[PDB]
Ligand binder design. Sequence first.
Ligand SMILES: Cc1ncc(COP(=O)(O)O)c([C@@H]2N[C@H](C(=O)O)C(C)(C)S2)c1O
Ligand SMILES: Cc1ncc(COP(=O)(O)O)c([C@@H]2N[C@H](C(=O)O)C(C)(C)S2)c1O
Lengths: 398, 395
Amino acid sequence: GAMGSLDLRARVREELERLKREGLYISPKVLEAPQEPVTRVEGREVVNLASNNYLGFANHPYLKEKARQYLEKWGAGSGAARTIAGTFTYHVELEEALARFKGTESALVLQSGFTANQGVLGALLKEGDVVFSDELNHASIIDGLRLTKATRLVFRHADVAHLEELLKAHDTDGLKLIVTDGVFSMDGDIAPLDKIVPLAKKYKAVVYVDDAHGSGVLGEKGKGTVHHFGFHQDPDVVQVATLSKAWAGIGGYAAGARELKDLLINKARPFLFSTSHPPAVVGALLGALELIEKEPERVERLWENTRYFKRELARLGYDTLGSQTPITPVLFGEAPLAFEASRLLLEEGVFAVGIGFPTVPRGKARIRNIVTAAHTKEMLDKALEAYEKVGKRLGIIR
Amino acid sequence: GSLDLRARVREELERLKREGLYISPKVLEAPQEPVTRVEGREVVNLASNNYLGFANHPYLKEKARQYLEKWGAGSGAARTIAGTFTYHVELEEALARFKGTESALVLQSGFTANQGVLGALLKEGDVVFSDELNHASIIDGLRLTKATRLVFRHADVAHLEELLKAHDTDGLKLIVTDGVFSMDGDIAPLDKIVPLAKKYKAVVYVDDAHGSGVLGEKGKGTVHHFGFHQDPDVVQVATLSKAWAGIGGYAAGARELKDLLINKARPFLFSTSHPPAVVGALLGALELIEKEPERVERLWENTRYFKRELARLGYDTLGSQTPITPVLFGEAPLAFEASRLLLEEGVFAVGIGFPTVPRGKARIRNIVTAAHTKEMLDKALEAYEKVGKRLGIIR
Ligand SMILES: Cc1ncc(COP(=O)(O)O)c([C@@H]2N[C@H](C(=O)O)C(C)(C)S2)c1O
Ligand SMILES: Cc1ncc(COP(=O)(O)O)c([C@@H]2N[C@H](C(=O)O)C(C)(C)S2)c1O
């Protein structure tokens, strides 16, 4: 109009004002001690139920020592993309260790779980393919699909009846790909692969699982959701997951046939066009895989802690939304009440972050608690005491 | 019937092999340095982006070690939830100070920074004006937006003006360019683009992956070089993985930009923050370049030397202006053969042909660094002379 196209500060102001009006403006907390089940926020020690540190690895000396070894040997940076002089021996060492752990012929690491989805989906899919995506799939899956030319269908969450209706109605001569989170990040439920994968065979579809929140959590020694349901050697199951949660570093990976690995090396755009991970990162992750083999009882402790916390929340009167994994949402309903409960929990010494629309539905705002192997009973009971006090105060529990 | 996974993979791998585009990367067997080891042999490495010699520098490694020991192996969360720690803020403050901008935000890569910042800025009804030769990660970031996308001929400010005149909007006009073009090593003409932006009420976005640590006073970057680092209508994105010899990307500009990105950039909202060893190395890098500003000088000395010697042999370096030093071979097969023959001489550089670069403009890309010595550069020049004579590109 009269004054011309917007300047940057005007565009920013208009978007920030809009977000503040919609109750979406965020001011994240700064942690002042390491990533542990007790940490420091705003000058205070707090029970931390906000992180993805499922196994207690993020500040574990074993990982730190292997990191240090690789840092000293190889340096601070790789200096290139994997394709052109950024692959070093340590990259391949980690890929081989991951494949062995996962039980697949091969494994390929990408720069994040977020980019792994983009890269793997983009390498696999082509115009005229059909994708069947779970309604509640992660945002990184959505962005990966949007960069492809595949036809995209959405099935109601975990609804295998709906999925079969779409598989009957929508055919192709190319690839049919059923795409799901393995463990859904917000509600903590598990994709029903026991039903999806047989369905896939009946309609000659491939299944793709983003197991970010199942790696190090489900299956024998944390080998993941796909391993848990017994499908880890099926070549028509594509396994993606992340190295940033249980494994407590950064990165994403795919695991399968030497030839799938070769496709990703040739085609995945975040692999072709982004720098490889540095030695300290890779050494920590090699450490993580060694430590879970040494201390597999961490996974048992994780699940013991989980069942305890969930049972005690239910006894107070809270709703954990049918969650099945250490992801333990507590329903508050409206986003303002979730955010107020998070504030009041912090006053009590408990750090857990409120989440509302658009991340989760209107009227299904929650606080996401993630239980870890490193939480103690007294930490969990402190968190439960805080939830009792706050919930009574807000009138959601008796 | 449908395709199964192995069939789709085989179809696509066979396709790439029939097109001669299937790649088999090499595995480096020693640290990222100007001399390294490939396939069991020592080589002069002209295939890194390690402009300042920081990748294996003990100063970065010691600061990395300190932060690893203090804070651990992982952040364990996205920045928005429980993944912002004191050391992230320390790095952002240090980066803003070095850049000369009001603010700085670190993101998981230069690749994802482009997606995050373009996504946060752009809305339906905005008009983008992109340089023909912009990086692939800019393309992917634009594809995720609902903005109208126009392409101007490479560095053609006449063309850009014609488009800016013809395509007005009540929303945002964003002129998007690499700062330093990854393949040819030329520099965006921001001294003409930015005035043109003012005339047509546009914002300028610069992906300065290959300018950060390279151009400008003390390596402050391309936007600093052209004098526009305090302009709120210039947005900079770059990588921390080349000169700064880590991983990560950053966005630098007006204070309000940072606030928008925190709230809106999808790779920021939906991915884990970087770990202490990575942040510590980068804090180290910013301290080291303030202590040893002569590294930037050496980088440019080395570049001028290499370029002049290649010209003296009879090679064409394509008008490159930065340490990115392409040598023209013409067709892709000859560039690949030259790269193979250079490796046999102990010189490691990257052959590039169509589709990445135009037909007839296939090249070997060499990146000179501050850490290359005269004897290394002369070894490279010796190999180029031998190979060039053998292939008849030079006399
Ligand atoms: C202009 C530009 N922007 C972003 C990146 C990615 O930064 P990162 O994600 O690694 O932080 C690159 C990379 N440069 C590589 C190279 O020049 O060798 C490439 C293999 C072409 S991709 C780039 O040139
Ligand atoms: C299913 C799924 N896939 C990929 C990623 C991205 O992995 P990264 O890029 O960090 O390696 C996530 C992240 N989970 C975060 C969290 O649940 O806390 C998120 C903040 C919702 S994004 C995820 O849930």
